[PDB]
Design a protein around this ligand. Structure first.
Ligand code: A1IDG
Length: 149
């Protein structure tokens, strides 16, 4: 679960959850199901608290979304501290960007949404991957902290 493949699937699962397009074969993992729950809760909070801010930007391509996402990541982790709450926050932001991109993309390609999932997993992997592993990974760190009590 420290690998890219795992984090990519978590980011793509979150996207399909936001887009209301779930895959039929089996469904998401307990880990993804716990994540979609806590990340959606955060996303709605960020949507309300950042209302004015969001309604001003225009996400017209995957490249425009990569830039906005990097900008948000730059200010989310500027103090250098990582915690599960901030990791959940990354997922919430890709959800905000996919909603905006569905609404404002110049060439509405359906194969662009999986590119968001790619640069989200790349960011998580390269910038928080080590912290995640040392804190228990997804199945012994994230789930144990956020699964229903
Ligand atoms: C409204 C401020 C701004 O221009 N930001 C750009 C932005 C990036 C990503 C998303 Cl999902 C919406 C808007 C901005 C917002 C929040 C930040 F933490 C940094 C930059």
């Amino acid at each position: 679960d420290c690998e890219f493949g795992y984090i990519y699937r978590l980011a793509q699962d979150y996207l399909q959850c936001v887009l209301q397009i779930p895959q039929p074969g089996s469904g998401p993992s307990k880990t993804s199901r716990v994540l979609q729950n806590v990340a959606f809760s955060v996303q709605k909070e960020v949507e309300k608290n950042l209302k004015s801010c969001l309604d001003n930007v225009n996400v017209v391509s995957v490249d425009t979304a990569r830039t906005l996402f990097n900008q948000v990541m730059e200010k989310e982790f500027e103090d250098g501290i990582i915690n599960w709450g901030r990791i959940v926050t990354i997922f919430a932001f890709e959800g905000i960007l996919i909603k905006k991109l569905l609404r404002q993309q110049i060439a509405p390609d359906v194969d662009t949404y999986k590119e968001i999932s790619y640069f989200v997993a790349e960011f998580i992997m390269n910038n928080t991957g080590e912290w995640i592993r040392q804190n228990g990974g997804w199945e012994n760190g994230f789930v144990k902290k956020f699964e229903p009590k």
